[PDB]
């Protein structure tokens, strides 16, 4: 149950040793280790492949982390220190901080706002074909209250402009595609679930959750909007907001699918770790091959041979230039044991352990150990690239 210690030993989590679940969920943790950054990169790449590049009419957009003009108080529980919290009662030597809240900037809380700002130009990009998408992965800042803090969350947001008639159909479509995407890569897909919800204005949507050991936590939310925010953004004229559903021009309904990757990456780490009657204890993070930060671990057999580094470096270059991430395990020395090395690589979610021995100079069969099975095999230096590529691709397929 306490796999956070494994996250500490192998740097998938941030620098600080004390990492409560509340900090991880809120986004107040110091950050993620290099393995955590790589896992986030893989997760974001999979999201981009599933949602953006394969899907037609969905385009990237970048929204600035900040807003530079006058904006209403927004989502500030504390009214700065100028209107609600003033020193003493008045304590005024000389103004509302010399600008009140007029010139104050704002840190983005969601990626929807920038997509709505880019709606008109990105509708010009397409030939006003109304089914349209704007996707973006970025960091969003939220206030966190403790009994003032800033929580940073990596969110992938898709803003889908749709004809009003097809809005519910596209809601079901994306609820079906996002849910199955989360189900895929999961060792226990049942832990991912969905729930239909209604907004305070009656605007229905969906919410996806992952069942962490303590309970269900929200990882994604789909919301359908009746061109409310779109019209509020552009109250001047409706003609410039019109897109072509068919031969007719209509103002789109906005479907915002907002998922988080940090709590999404938290959900996959918990899924990988696993719990009765086994009497067989082996701490391993059985991450999906597509999300595992490091695929293969390279080593050297004895070290007196000293001709293993050359071939190991060549294999390193061959694998890296072919898109396989490799752990340079042939530099570390004074290990004195192969069991602890295997345990380490298991806890790092290393799919394969490749070991080059003094028996590789002749009959160049390297030793291969698997994460899933602790079984040793012999495989030629040739076609190892092809075997690993096939493994990753077939894991992608199924």
């Amino acid at each position: 149950a306490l796999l956070e210690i494994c996250q500490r030993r192998h740097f998938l989590s941030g620098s600080k040793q004390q990492l409560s679940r509340d900090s991880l969920l809120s986004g107040c943790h110091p950050g993620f280790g290099p393995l955590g950054v790589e896992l986030r990169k893989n997760l974001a790449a999979e999201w981009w492949t599933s949602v953006v590049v394969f899907r037609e009419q969905v385009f990237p957009v970048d929204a600035l982390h900040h807003k530079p003009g006058p904006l209403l108080p927004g989502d500030s529980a504390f009214r700065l220190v100028s209107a609600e919290t003033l020193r003493e009662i008045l304590q005024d030597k000389e103004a509302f901080l010399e600008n009140v809240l007029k010139t104050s900037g704002k840190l983005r809380e969601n990626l929807l706002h920038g997509a709505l700002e880019h709606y008109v130009n990105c509708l010009d990009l397409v030939n006003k074909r109304l089914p349209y998408g704007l996707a973006q992965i970025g960091v969003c800042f939220h206030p966190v209250f403790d009994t003032k803090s800033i929580g940073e969350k990596t969110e992938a947001s898709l803003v889908w402009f749709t004809p009003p008639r097809t809005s519910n159909q596209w809601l079901d479509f994306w609820l079906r595609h996002r849910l199955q995407w989360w189900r895929k890569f999961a060792m226990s897909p049942s832990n991912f679930s969905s729930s239909d919800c209604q907004d305070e204005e009656g605007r229905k949507g969906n919410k996806l959750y992952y069942n962490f050991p303590w309970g269900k936590e929200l990882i994604e939310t789909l919301w359908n909007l009746g061109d409310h925010e779109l019209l509020h953004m552009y109250p001047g004229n409706v003609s410039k907001l019109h897109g072509r559903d068919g031969r007719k021009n209509v103002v789109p309904c906005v479907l915002s699918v907002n998922g988080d990757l940090d709590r999404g990456m938290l959900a996959y780490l918990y899924d990988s770790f696993q719990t009765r009657k086994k009497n067989l204890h082996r701490k391993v993070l059985k991450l999906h091959p597509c999300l595992a930060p490091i695929k293969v671990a390279l080593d050297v057999g004895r070290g007196p041979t000293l001709e293993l580094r050359q071939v190991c470096q060549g294999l390193f270059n061959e694998l890296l230039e072919n898109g396989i991430s490799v752990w340079p395990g042939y530099l570390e020395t004074m290990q004195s044991s192969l069991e602890q090395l295997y345990s380490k690589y298991d806890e790092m979610s290393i799919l394969f352990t490749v070991l080059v021995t003094e028996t590789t100079l002749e009959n160049g069969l390297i030793h291969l150990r698997s994460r899933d099975t602790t079984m040793k095999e012999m495989m030629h230096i040739s076609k190892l690239k092809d075997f690993l590529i096939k493994y990753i691709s077939s894991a992608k397929n199924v």
Partner: protein, 941 residues
């Protein structure tokens, strides 16, 4: 107007039948029969009266009316068939034409290109390549005058649409300057619906008044085989009765031709290029494949010539032919949502299988770690597996590099990869490399071979059916040595090299517990290692995916033809819900009009009675049949068609009243409240649940008897043999021991000094049983159906020996009566739609349910027509017996559903997807008594 009850509610303002048979005065027998026990005096609250001006009847009598309607409908097609009968067809062409399109062959075989055959009658056959399925090719037809051939996509080598718009052949005329009839054309064929599916104009939403005759349907009506009869016929290539095989045959064209024509046997290509051959080999074998198809057409023509007189003399009523012609034009409209449904069902199947498989892979991978101790008395389940490894595997400081490009590492890698030759010295360089020598042998068995086209990592072959999977996760009675490959204190589960027992049904050796062990899972006596959820979850997933596993090839391979904008009617395009980017098309279900004995229509995909269920995947197949914009599905199901048809023919056999028989009384009147219903009365005699009585009775009508009843009672309640014997008392509804037996036609059972048999003139029970009529008509003269008499097949005729198929024949009586009811409904509906110009002639029919694709503006009118049909048809039934009247309760459909999709009710088909209404769908409106406010004439409210 008036109530008009003759002891029970009957319809008034009849406007049909009359007062020819006023009063029976023989009610002395019916009152006494209803008086035994209770069952006689119930309240029977009245029903509201219905006043309606029925359309005029031409025949001045109900039977004459229906005969006139059927004759007027089927006259052009009957005379087209007769033109086919008197056909002096010239010989086959010497060389078939390679030209594209349709080619006609005149005297001495000259080839002339023609747009279409331009023939009133045709015998038609289409052979499809099937390398690119759904596309027709190599078609061949004959008319009374000449031969015709049809070619497409073999002259040109080009990429094709794959949507099959103009792939179907063109066979219907343009209605302009037609020969003589008014484009009334009949197309004859063996499995003619398959050939109909490849006709260009058959997919238009508007009717084309081209009808299709199936030689298979007429064969099954004339001389067909039941299931047991078919099995015995195949076995012989019915104890002490083997003369029905000379007059019967299987549905194959060769055997049918042998039976009816009996010429030289038909020769089929052993290459079968159309079934498994590629498009290329079909292209080179054009003449031979063209010669075989034409020979099949000739065989079908000769069979049709030998069949039509026999069918007409065995089914004299024109209603039968009209109904078959109407069943031959079934039509299922579909839209772009069909492709979405196929994709979503396949995807759900794939992810459910992937989830189960991945759980299996995880268990296998975790089990592989026990190789350290080799599982010697370590794992109680994996102690018997094989854990073998093949004999031999594969048989300082800180430095900085300057700007110097070096290839030493790459050269070393290339040299290392050059050492594949040394694998020959290790005997590994062979074409097949060693497969997973390190892993245990069972794990290799579960893992796909390397370099496979469909290779996947891990033990991907695991599918929960293998004997290893329970050894992974299935802790059953007393551990689980699952398989013994052969046949103490208190041992709940015994595997001690003896007693092949795991609490299975009867005493079966094997039991993979993929089904019917769920109650053992919930009981707790059958648990999985990982927990109490894994085993039940696997069984649940199996339940969801079983139907799709069985039916995905059939469902996904359905011929769908998508109409373009031009082909759609003007009403569809101008509808507000018209989708310019959407796809609209149709599926012709490919039904056999008379598929089985009883002439019941057969289609495994569509006509199967299976509505959408919450759990099973892909079960919304019917719900995807969605009307186009501006159209709707107006349809209804017959309320207890089989049970009512059984209730009638028993009351008429007893007296002139409908409710005279106790079974007929409870069928006509009586609801779940009180014991007035059949199920409650059955459960009253012997204490059982109403569901148990329902399951008993449905089956009690069709055979059953003491053995089935006692075995099912044992299965349900596990009663002692004494109560099984006492079930003879419960079988008193069937009048057990009526008719050595103590009861017969003579009152005195005891007799002696009898030279010959006596008191054996007639047989029948006398205790709340309708089986007397069914048994009497089962063993009767040539005509065997009371309503529009159509004879049973010559296979089941009781001529000479009995053949011991009594159950099949008594079932045939009711089921063929139901088919006659369906034909009556179809002819009445066709007449009503044609007379009053109700748009949307098309129809679908699944068992008792019948639906029509109707323009929405006419939808309510169609519903009224449907209700009127349900009157006349039922009245027609009552007319063909001595009733001469109908109850008000059964006079009309309980509800006529007007919907946009095909579902049993409006509130169904939840199924796997969360929001079936989330997809574009709107609730229908079963009408009932409301639709009567309108009138069938076009001038409506």
């Amino acid at each position: 107007l008036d109530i008009q009850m003759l002891s029970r509610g009957l319809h008034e303002q009849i406007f049909g039948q009359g007062g020819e048979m006023p009063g029976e005065a023989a009610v002395r027998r019916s009152v006494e029969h209803l008086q035994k026990h209770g069952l006689w005096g119930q309240p029977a609250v009245p029903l509201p009266d219905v006043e309606l001006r029925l359309p005029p009847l031409y025949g001045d009598n109900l039977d004459q009316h229906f005969r006139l309607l059927a004759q007027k409908q089927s006259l052009p097609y009957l005379e087209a068939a007769n033109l086919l009968l008197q056909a002096q067809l010239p010989p086959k062409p010497p060389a078939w034409a390679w030209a594209e399109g349709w080619t006609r062959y005149g005297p001495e075989g000259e080839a002339v290109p023609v747009a279409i055959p331009e023939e009133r009658a045709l015998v038609f056959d289409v052979e499809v390549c099937l390398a690119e399925g759904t596309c027709p090719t190599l078609a061949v037809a004959i008319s009374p005058s000449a031969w015709y051939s049809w070619c497409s996509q073999r002259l040109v080598e080009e990429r094709y649409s794959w949507t099959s718009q103009l792939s179907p052949a063109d066979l219907i005329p343009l209605e302009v300057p037609t020969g003589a009839d008014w484009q009334e054309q009949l197309v004859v064929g063996h499995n003619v619906s398959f050939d109909r599916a490849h006709i260009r104009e058959q997919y238009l939403i508007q009717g084309s008044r081209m009808r299709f005759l199936d030689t298979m349907s007429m064969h099954m009506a004339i001389s067909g085989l039941s299931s047991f009869q078919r099995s015995l016929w195949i076995a012989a290539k019915a104890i002490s009765s083997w003369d029905w095989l000379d007059i019967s045959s299987v549905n194959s064209l060769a055997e049918v031709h042998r039976l009816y024509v009996g010429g030289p046997p038909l020769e089929k290509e052993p290459r079968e290029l159309f079934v498994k051959g590629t498009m290329k080999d079909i292209r080179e074998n054009f003449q031979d494949l063209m010669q075989y198809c034409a020979q099949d057409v000739w065989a079908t023509h000769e069979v049709f010539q030998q069949q039509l007189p026999l069918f007409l003399e065995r089914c004299p009523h024109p209603v039968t032919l009209a109904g078959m012609l109407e069943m031959g034009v079934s039509y299922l409209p579909v839209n772009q949502n069909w492709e979405r449904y196929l994709a979503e069902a396949q995807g759900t199947y794939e992810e459910l299988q992937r989830e189960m498989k991945k759980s299996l892979m995880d268990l296998a991978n975790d089990a592989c770690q026990l190789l350290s101790g080799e599982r010697y008395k370590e794992d109680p389940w994996l102690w018997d597996l094989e854990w073998d490894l093949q004999e031999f595997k594969q048989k300082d400081q800180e430095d900085l590099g300057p700007c110097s490009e070096e290839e030493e590492f790459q050269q070393d890698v290339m040299a290392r990869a050059c050492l594949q030759k040394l694998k020959g010295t290790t005997e590994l360089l062979p074409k097949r490399p060693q497969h997973l020598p390190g892993h245990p042998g069972w794990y290799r068995k579960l893992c796909p071979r390397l370099d496979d086209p469909a290779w996947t990592p891990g033990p991907s072959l695991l599918s929960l059916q293998m004997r290893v999977t329970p050894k992974l996760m299935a802790l059953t009675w007393d551990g689980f040595p699952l398989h013994y490959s052969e046949r103490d204190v208190d041992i709940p589960g015994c595997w001690f090299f003896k007693l092949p027992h795991k609490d299975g049904n009867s005493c079966n050796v094997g039991s993979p517990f993929a089904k019917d062990f769920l109650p053992k899972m919930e009981d707790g006596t059958l648990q999985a290692g990982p927990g109490g959820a894994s085993g039940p979850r696997a069984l649940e997933i199996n339940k969801m995916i079983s139907f799709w596993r069985n039916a995905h090839k059939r469902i996904s391979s359905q011929m769908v033809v998508w109409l373009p904008r031009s082909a759609l009617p003007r009403a569809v395009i101008r509808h507000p819900d018209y989708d310019e980017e959407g796809l609209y098309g149709a599926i012709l279900p490919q039904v056999v009009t008379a598929g089985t004995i009883t002439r019941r229509a057969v289609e495994p995909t569509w006509l199967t009675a299976s509505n959408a269920r919450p759990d099973r995947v892909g079960s919304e197949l019917k719900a995807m049949v969605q009307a186009p914009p501006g159209y709707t599905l107006v349809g209804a199901d017959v309320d207890s068609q089989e049970l009512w048809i059984a209730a009638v023919l028993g009351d008429a056999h007893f007296a002139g009243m409908h409710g005279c028989t106790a079974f007929g009384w409870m069928t006509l009147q009586g609801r779940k409240s009180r014991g007035t219903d059949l199920h409650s009365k059955t459960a009253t005699t012997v204490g059982i649940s109403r569901e148990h009585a329902k399951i008993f009775n449905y089956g009690r009508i069709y055979g059953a008897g003491q053995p089935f009843a006692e075995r099912l009672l044992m299965q349900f309640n596990h009663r002692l043999t004494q109560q099984e014997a006492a079930e003879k008392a419960q079988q008193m509804y069937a009048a057990t021991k009526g008719l050595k037996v103590q009861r017969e036609t003579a009152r005195k059972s005891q007799w002696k000094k009898w030279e010959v048999v006596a008191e054996r003139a007639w047989k029948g029970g006398t205790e709340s049983e309708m089986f007397n009529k069914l048994e009497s008509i089962a063993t009767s003269d040539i005509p065997r159906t009371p309503v529009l008499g159509c004879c049973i097949s010559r296979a089941l005729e009781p001529s000479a020996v009995q053949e011991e198929f009594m159950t099949s024949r008594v079932n045939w009586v009711v089921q063929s009566s139901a088919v006659d009811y369906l034909h009556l409904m179809l002819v009445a509906m066709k007449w009503l739609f044609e007379e009053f110009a109700i748009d949307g002639r098309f129809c679908i029919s699944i068992h008792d349910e019948v639906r029509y694709l109707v323009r929405e503006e006419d939808r309510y009118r169609a519903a009224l027509a449907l209700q009127i049909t349900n009157l006349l048809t039922r009245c027609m039934f009552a007319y063909k017996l001595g009733l001469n009247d109908l109850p008000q309760s059964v006079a009309f459909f309980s509800a006529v559903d007007i919907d946009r999709c095909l579902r049993k009710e409006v509130t169904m088909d939840c199924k796997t997807p969360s929001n079936p209404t989330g997809m574009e769908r709107r609730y229908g409106i079963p009408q009932g008594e409301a639709l009567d406010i309108y009138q069938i004439i076009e001038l409506t409210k």
